[PDB]
């Protein structure tokens, strides 16, 4: 649980966990869809790599919604609604078994 | 075996005398004091401090204010502020003071201090009206 | 005038010792609560009058106050009498809060003790222990200077001997102090008003 | 009670109680009951 | 799966314990007050 | 709620009777592109916007189906 | 480049939704675009019974009413109480660096006046030769 | 008045099972970056410092450094009770492994520490003070059984209050219609009142578990 | 016809810290109305003055280094816990004493 | 057929345990009156204590209501 | 918000095409499943009446057996009808 | 019949929380008497608290009676 | 005869709210004694509050008695 | 032979309510102890209030006993 | 035979009525403690009134026990 | 074999009178705490009276347990 | 047959005992309010002892609930 | 098979009797609060008396629980 091997504070600067200090890659929102499969195959798919990407996205969310000074209740309501959506997607088998309509 | 001291600042009624029982209307509620009572210190409110003397004769005394102090060696010291018996009281003066206090309460308005003093004089007026009718 | 004022003070001794027939048991029964709790300890009260040619009684009070200043220099002093304030001004004018005046020319009553107690407790100063130094009355020809230890609300609330005293809360102990302190001052005033006159009658007689 | 709640201590309450107690002695004893100050 | 639930709850409790252990606000109060009491002066010869 | 109604007035108009060649030109532009190219040459953000636009358009089918069946929550 | 801390968080519409999710649709369908999309998605999830209105949906309503009431009542009190302590930490922090700079300049004059004793030490032995 | 519903504690709802419903405190963990804290970080620091100051008189010399574990337990209970009451998140304490890990091992550690270090205290805490000779054996047996079942009672209580709250909430929701605005509004209002009661009960339950843990660590 | 500068001589000492001047002030008052030892003491005091001057210069340089460290430090507004633990090496580390509020 | 009948009797017995909750709520609020008679400046803190006690008493009542509804339409 | 510009006529045209097609498709499907639900409700009512009569007879026999078992357990008199 | 008979027994057994309601109401108004004896200037606030406690004890009794009627006509 | 038997059982098990009414009346009148010992100068107001509390306690008992009579006869 | 059986069961259930009368008398006379401990000179009215409170709580107990006898020899 | 069986059930139900008598004895002697703590020189009158309270709650307990015995044998 | 079942129900229902012994024991010893806090110099008489009150409450509870064991093993 | 029926009846009976838990917790927090009326400086120790009493009363009531569930399922 | 059923019902009815023990534990700890607010210097003696009273009330409650587990298994 230390800094990644692509980070050196003499070159980069202070550690922001929401940053990627590795190779300067093409942004995900600008891939021209003809090389998108090669773009998805370019990224490593180890559980360490996907955990690093998930934590980077989570810390980007923290830096946009929590870590600013005037942080409101919006990040926590956002987390609650996302958790309710995801656990409804988990419990969709139980939800579809009861329902309200019979034909629909 | 009770050493009772009833002492107004102008009259001293009992000076460590032997008294069977002392009833005292206090801010902690009216209570009766007997020999080997609990140590308890109480703050007097207007009303009759009736003393059951050891000869079988009971003498009632009003108190304007004061403190009641019961000690663990069975000794009481009721130190009043004004105290003359129920024998000398004028009912009409008590009613006039009560009416004046009620007028001061009604004419106080936003004056919290005058309202408080009118309430105090209302308490004393009710106590005096109640005591003089015996 | 010293021989002529000898019988003037005798009238003011017969109206201050006969008036001590009932003001003395009121002060003995006031301290009996303090005689049982037995607390040891600021606050200093001086008892005098606003009249001159008193001999050395106010000198004795000032001597006792000078002795008291060497023990607790953080004491704010409230005096009954302008002469003690005038004596102690040059000494401790930085530590003089208020001194109650207009006393001595008339025999004391309870309203004076109530006013002094209200002046003591309504100043907002933080005090725990204290004493009221007063010139007690032993005999006509000579007396003794003593003091009564006074206590605040928190001094008796935190006492180890108050636990036997029940039916108590914050309001009862607060309301008991501001009448007991107004009753001890009345005992110091009535004894001092005899000693300040009975020892002045002989000071007028010594020149007679 | 309402005494302490209105920033009035027990000395002033004592004074009012004793004044009203002295004043109820008209025909013989208001003269010989109050020494004033 | 009760052992799995036990391990999950224990790991969550350990994570919360590490979160609480690190949840503090550090403050710097090592100012220059001690330097003012070091008035070193040279003595004199007589 | 008034400003939202003004925005809906601006941006929910049915297509007029005079712009049929323009809408058919756009339809055949999409048809001629997607069978030849221009879909493997569109960025992820732009294609995501196109798919979300298509989904929003398709939602009017279900809204009009709820209009055309009475109760909104399923049939009856 | 060093990170910077903005005063305000990300722009939020409809209470919890990001504003960027709405402004993404401005090049295609303006303002009522995202709202029409959200309304159509809600009506699609309700109509097909994908989003089942079961007993849990009547608890999320009771959660949201209490949740809106608590935020709309205690929101400014708690935020101002919290933001008061952030400044007081900075007030504790600004009493460190400001005092340390002035405290060091005071310590310079302590070292400067220690040299003044050495400056006046020369005249000390020039003052003892007069008594002879 | 009509019917009710049940079977909501299923751990096998999908492939992604309900074990992700216990990791949601990690999302609500306060992750700190800047030197000057944020509003949720400062609020959490104030809450934890207040709890530490309140429980400082109950720590003791044996568990002076174990207050962090007690605070982590308090946060664990609070997050498993508050976020467990949200409608689409299942009750984790319904399965008793969570309450087992929450309550049982610390009691086992405390009773083993008592049995190893102070055996005299272990044999003397069962016997009440001032108890004569003929009053001994029934007190001994009753106190032994009660003290051997007490952590089990605490765990079953900490599960059962949430079980009762969620059952009553689901029962109130199931007896609510949609076409009748009056009945739905009454159901929603009663669920608001019940949710306030359950939130208060959850906070008080976490606080009483923290206080019992601190007082038993003082023993 | 002889006198010294008493003002600088009085202001040189920190009064009570070097009160032996005041005893010398009482001595020199009565004289108002061994030379080689003083010259040797002048040489020794000159060497000690040079030593104290270079020590004071070193202390002044250290204080200037501390002031430069404070000036080069980033402000406490846009600073992180990593930058705080870098500029202040007190830190919280693995081989540290256990505390509740570290 | 006797199982649902005994479920009815069990729920009827199970609803008795709300009596103790009612008595506890009564004791809490009566003692709130008594405690408000002495030092009425602590009104907010004593009302907070009253709500803290009332919530736990009604939680004990809800335990028995839960046991009544578990026997009735859940077991 | 930002001032509104008119939507390029592909979202509007497809939107209203889907709207009108959804209206007519919902009407057609509602009519067809209304007929289907009518006939399904009729046959379900028939089989439900038959099943309810059979279950009522079975439950009457079960209650008779339960009352006989209760009489044999509790020791009460056995009525000639139960 | 045994189902309606057991509904009768369940209704009778459910009408017991009114005992807890009555005990709570008695405690509330007795403590009103006690707390009005000391500091009687607070008749308004004391009676407001007595009304609140009586209302909540009545709420517990009405919950038990509502369960008694639901065990006789609904469940 | 089974249904009338269970009516009898329910009417016997529903008349134990009189227990709680008796407990509440005892608490009311006992605290009347306690609060008349302390400050007897409010005797009429204390007794009026006692009458109010006893009336509400007997009302809670009469609710259970009404359910005992109306289980056996009416509903 | 089941109707008289239910009469016995209902009477036995009905006689639980005298427990509340017993607890009420206990609280009344304990309050008499407490309120005569202070003010010994009020025993002519404290004992009258105790007699009245005991009479009312025992009257509720006797009404419960009459309810027990009505389920056995009157209905 | 079910008549003697329900006699046994009725006596078992009637024995619950002694719980309130036991609670009344506990209340009267606990308040004997409280009333002897304040002003203990009234020990004889306090114990006479405590014995009166014990007797008047034991009367309710013996009433319940006699009801149980009467249902078992005399009824 | 109905009567053995009845004796089991009567024993289980007669063992509810021990609740009153528990409540009375709690009342008398909590009041022992109260009455020892005020005037603690009378611990001898306080503990004597508290043991007497506990003895009588336990006597009521043992009377109920004896009635249960007699209802199960004597009649 | 009637075994599971009596399991329902016994569970519904055994869950009554949380009424005493509710009454005890109400008494604990009511006396907490009374004990905070005087001496508010002992707030932490008052809260500690109130939490202790609440936990022990809830332990007894949940022991009743635990025995009810043990009677219901495990047997 | 009615014997095992009645053992179940008697076990539940016996487990009712822990209610008064929970109420007594609540009473003794609430009076520990009100006896520690007054005279806090006797904390050890007051907590010792609380432990004794809680132990005795818990002994009564576990006697009820033992009579529940005795009918259920050994009677
Ligand atoms: C004795 C011991 C006791 C010790 C005591 C110790 C003391 C404790 C100390 C407490 C410390 C606090 C803890 C730390 C928390 C940190 C919080 C923080 O720092 O934030 C500061 C924060 C500052 O907030 P702010 O936003 O800057 O200021 C408030 C503004 O006024 C903002 O107001 P506004 O005017 O901008 O309002 C807008 C906003 C304000 O309102 C809200 O924020 C409320 C949000 C809802 C609440 C939660 C519900 C979410 C979903 C749940 C249900 C899921 C099912 C799905 C939906 C079903 C039903 C709809 O939302 C709205 O009202 C708009 C509509 C609501 C949107 C929600 C969804 C609606 C649906 C419509 C369509 C959308 C599609 C949804 C898809 C789903 C289907 O201050 C607070 O702390 C506020 C909260 C106070 C607590 C309230 C609760 C208790 C009272 C384990
Ligand atoms: C939550 C998302 C955070 C938003 C932050 C953001 O977009 O900027 C930061 C950054 C954008 O970086 P960038 O593209 O270089 O900056 C360009 C600008 O920000 C400009 O942003 P952009 O050009 O990248 O565009 C934003 C993009 C953002 O792309 C994403 O989708 C986010 C990328 C990461 C995916 C994971 C996000 C969480 C998944 C959602 C499920 C739970 C959310 C619950 C809340 C909503 C539920 C109703 O979204 C869209 O393009 C629009 C989405 C359309 C769907 C919404 C439907 C219409 C709404 C109308 C509602 C009407 C009813 C009222 O995005 C992130 O990295 C966010 C990662 C956060 C991870 C989630 C952690 C936990 C969340 C709660 C559980």
């Amino acid at each position: 649980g230390d800094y990644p091997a692509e980070y050196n504070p003499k070159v980069h600067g202070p550690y922001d966990p929401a940053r990627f200090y590795g190779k300067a890659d093409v942004p995900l929102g600008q891939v021209k869809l003809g090389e998108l499969s090669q773009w998805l195959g370019r990224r490593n798919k180890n559980p360490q790599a996907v955990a690093a990407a998930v934590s980077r996205g989570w810390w980007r969310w923290q830096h946009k919604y929590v870590l600013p000074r005037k942080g409101g209740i919006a990040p926590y309501i956002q987390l609650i609604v996302g958790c309710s959506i995801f656990f409804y997607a988990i419990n969709y088998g139980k939800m579809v078994a009861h329902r309200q309509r019979k034909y629909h | 075996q009770m050493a009772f001291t009833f002492a107004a600042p102008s009259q001293v009624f009992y000076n460590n005398a032997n008294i069977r029982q002392v009833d005292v209307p206090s801010f902690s509620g009216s209570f009766g004091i007997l020999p080997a009572h609990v140590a308890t210190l109480a703050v007097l409110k207007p009303g009759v401090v009736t003393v059951y003397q050891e000869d079988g004769s009971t003498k009632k005394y009003f108190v304007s204010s004061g403190t009641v102090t019961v000690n663990d060696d069975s000794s009481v010291q009721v130190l009043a502020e004004e105290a003359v018996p129920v024998e000398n009281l004028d009912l009409q003066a008590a009613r006039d003071i009560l009416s004046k206090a009620q007028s001061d309460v009604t004419s106080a308005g936003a004056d919290m201090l005058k309202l408080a003093e009118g309430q105090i004089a209302v308490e004393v007026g009710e106590a005096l009206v109640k005591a003089a009718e015996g | 005038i010293t021989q002529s004022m000898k019988m003037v003070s005798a009238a003011k001794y017969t109206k201050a010792e006969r008036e001590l027939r009932v003001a003395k048991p009121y002060g003995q029964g006031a301290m009996k609560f303090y005689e049982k709790t037995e607390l040891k300890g600021q606050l200093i009260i001086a008892i005098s009058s606003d009249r001159g040619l008193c001999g050395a009684v106010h000198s004795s009070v000032g001597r006792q106050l000078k002795a008291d200043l060497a023990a607790n220099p953080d004491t704010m002093v409230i005096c009954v009498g302008d002469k003690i304030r005038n004596i102690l001004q040059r000494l401790y004018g930085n530590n003089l809060a208020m001194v109650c005046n207009d006393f001595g020319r008339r025999p004391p009553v309870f309203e004076d003790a109530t006013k002094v107690a209200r002046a003591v407790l309504e100043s907002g100063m933080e005090f725990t222990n204290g004493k009221i130094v007063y010139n007690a009355f032993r005999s006509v020809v000579s007396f003794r200077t003593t003091d009564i230890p006074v206590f605040s609300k928190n001094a008796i609330e935190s006492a180890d001997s108050i636990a036997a005293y029940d039916s108590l809360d914050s309001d009862v102990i607060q309301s008991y102090v501001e009448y007991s302190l107004a009753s001890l001052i009345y005992y110091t005033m009535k004894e001092n008003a005899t000693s300040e006159q009975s020892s002045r009658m002989t000071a007028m007689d010594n020149a007679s | 009670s309402g005494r302490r709640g209105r920033h009035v201590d027990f000395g002033a309450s004592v004074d009012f109680e004793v004044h009203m107690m002295r004043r109820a002695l008209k025909p013989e004893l208001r003269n010989e009951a109050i020494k004033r100050e | 799966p009760w052992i799995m639930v036990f391990l999950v709850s224990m790991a969550l409790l350990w994570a919360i314990m590490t979160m609480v252990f690190f949840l503090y606000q550090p403050r710097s109060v090592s100012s220059a007050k001690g330097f003012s009491d070091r008035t070193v002066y040279l003595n004199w010869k007589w | 709620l008034a400003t939202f109604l003004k925005y809906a007035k601006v941006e929910l108009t049915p297509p007029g009777p005079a712009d049929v060649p323009k809408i058919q030109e756009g339809i055949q532009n999409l048809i001629h592109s997607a069978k030849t190219g221009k879909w493997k040459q569109v960025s992820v953000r732009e294609a995501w916007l196109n798919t979300l636009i298509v989904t929003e358009i398709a939602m009017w089918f279900f809204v009009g189906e709820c209009i055309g069946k009475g109760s909104v929550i399923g049939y009856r | 480049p060093r990170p910077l801390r903005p005063v305000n968080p990300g722009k939020v519409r409809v209470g919890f939704v990001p504003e960027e999710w709405f402004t993404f649709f401005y090049n295609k369908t303006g303002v009522t675009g995202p709202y029409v999309l959200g309304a159509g998605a809600l009506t699609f999830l309700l109509s097909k019974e994908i989003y089942v209105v079961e007993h849990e949906f009547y608890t999320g309503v009771a959660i949201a009413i209490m949740g809106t009431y608590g935020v709309k009542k205690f929101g400014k009190q708690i935020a101002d109480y919290a933001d008061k302590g952030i400044g007081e930490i900075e007030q504790s922090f600004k009493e460190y660096q400001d005092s340390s700079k002035i405290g060091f300049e005071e310590a310079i004059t302590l070292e400067e006046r220690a040299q003044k004793s050495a400056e006046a030490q020369i005249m000390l032995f020039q003052a003892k030769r007069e008594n002879v | 008045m009509m019917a009710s519903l049940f079977s909501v504690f299923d751990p096998t709802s999908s492939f992604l099972s309900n074990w992700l419903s216990m990791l949601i405190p990690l999302l609500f963990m306060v992750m700190s970056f800047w030197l000057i804290p944020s509003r949720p970080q400062f609020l959490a620091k104030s809450v934890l410092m207040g709890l530490n100051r309140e429980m400082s008189l109950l720590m003791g010399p044996a568990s002076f450094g174990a207050n962090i574990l007690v605070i982590a337990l308090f946060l664990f209970i609070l997050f498993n009770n508050f976020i467990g009451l949200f409608p689409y998140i299942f009750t984790a304490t319904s399965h008793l492994a969570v309450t087992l890990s929450l309550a049982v091992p610390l009691w086992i550690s405390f009773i083993l520490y008592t049995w190893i270090k102070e055996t005299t205290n272990a044999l003397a805490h069962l016997v009440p003070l001032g108890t004569p000779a003929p009053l001994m054996p029934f007190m001994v047996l009753m106190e032994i059984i009660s003290n051997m079942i007490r952590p089990i009672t605490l765990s079953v209580r900490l599960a059962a209050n949430m079980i009762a709250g969620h059952l009553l909430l689901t029962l109130l929701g199931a007896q609510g219609t949609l076409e009748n605005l009056y009945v739905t509004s009454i159901v929603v209002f009663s669920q608001i009142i019940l949710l306030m009661l359950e939130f208060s009960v959850a906070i008080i339950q976490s606080y009483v578990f923290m206080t019992l843990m601190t007082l038993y660590a003082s023993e | 016809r002889s006198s010294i500068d008493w003002a600088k001589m009085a202001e040189s000492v920190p009064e009570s810290q070097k009160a032996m001047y005041n005893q010398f002030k009482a001595k020199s008052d009565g004289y108002i109305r061994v030379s080689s030892q003083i010259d040797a003491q002048e040489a020794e005091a000159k060497k000690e003055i040079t030593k104290f001057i270079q020590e004071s210069r070193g202390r002044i340089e250290n204080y200037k280094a501390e002031l430069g460290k404070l000036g080069q430090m980033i402000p406490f507004e846009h600073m992180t816990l990593e930058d705080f633990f870098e500029a202040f090496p007190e830190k919280v580390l693995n081989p540290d004493p256990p505390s509740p509020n570290v | 057929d006797i199982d649902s009948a005994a479920k009815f009797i069990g729920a009827g017995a199970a609803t008795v345990g709300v009596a103790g909750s009612g008595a506890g709520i009564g004791s809490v609020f009566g003692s709130l009156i008594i405690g408000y008679a002495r030092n009425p400046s602590l009104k907010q803190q004593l009302f907070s204590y009253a709500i803290l006690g009332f919530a736990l008493s009604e939680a004990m009542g809800l335990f028995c209501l839960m046991m009544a509804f578990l026997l009735l339409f859940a077991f | 918000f930002a001032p509104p510009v008119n939507v390029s006529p592909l979202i509007r045209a497809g939107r209203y095409g889907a709207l009108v097609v959804g209206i007519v498709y919902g009407s057609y499907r509602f009519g067809s499943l209304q007929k289907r639900e009518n006939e399904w409700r009729v046959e379900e009512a028939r089989r439900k009446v038959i099943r309810d009569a059979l279950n009522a007879e079975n439950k009457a026999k079960a209650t008779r057996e339960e009352m006989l078992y209760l009489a044999k357990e509790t020791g009460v008199k056995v009525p000639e009808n139960f």
Side-chain angles (χ1 to χ4, degrees), chain A residues 27-36 39 100-104, chain F residues 39-47 69 71-76:
Chain A
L28 50 98
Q30 295 182 4
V31 198
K32 219 181 63 259
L33 252 73
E35 330 296 327
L36 188 49
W39 197 94
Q100 189 73 24
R101 299 297 183 186
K102 301 192 63 180
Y103 277 73
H104 98 283
Chain F
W39 70 282
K40 299 175 298 182
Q41 293 85 6
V42 152
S43 53
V44 176
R45 185 182 295 276
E46 186 187 1
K69 75 187 166 187
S71 62
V72 278
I73 308 177
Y75 283 85
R76 187 63 170 272

Side-chain angles (χ1 to χ4, degrees), chain H residues 72-91:
Chain H
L73 286 185
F74 178 84
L75 295 199
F76 183 84
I77 299 167
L78 186 54
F79 293 152
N80 284 25
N81 288 14
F82 262 2
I83 322 291
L85 274 171
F86 279 95
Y88 298 113
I89 310 183
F90 96 110
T91 297

Side-chain angles (χ1 to χ4, degrees), chain K residues 2-72:
Chain K
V5 203
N6 56 341
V7 187
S8 178
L10 279 185
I11 313 183
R12 297 182 174 180
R15 156 192 289 103
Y16 275 85
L19 174 64
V20 181
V21 165
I23 289 179
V24 297
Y25 194 96
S27 66
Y28 169 79
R29 184 176 162 187
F30 182 58
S32 61
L33 81 91
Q34 189 69 27
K35 304 170 189 179
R36 183 191 177 184
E37 275 186 4
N38 283 321
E39 56 179 359
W40 202 93
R41 183 68 180 92
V42 166
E43 58 89 13
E44 188 66 32
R46 293 183 306 180
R47 65 177 60 186
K48 211 274 173 181
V49 163
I50 298 174
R51 184 191 60 181
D52 180 65
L54 181 58
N55 293 337
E57 295 182 357
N58 178 267
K59 193 51 184 179
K61 189 182 303 302
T63 50
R64 178 180 177 180
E65 295 157 353
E66 271 265 358
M67 292 304 298
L68 289 182
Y69 179 75
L70 282 168
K72 289 303 172 179

Side-chain angles (χ1 to χ4, degrees), chain G residues 80-98:
Chain G
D80 292 4
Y81 161 73
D83 215 340
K84 177 191 299 184
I86 312 301
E88 289 175 3
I89 290 171
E90 299 198 27
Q91 283 182 0
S92 178
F93 266 157
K94 78 190 303 178
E95 284 176 5
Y96 168 76
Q97 193 184 4
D98 301 357

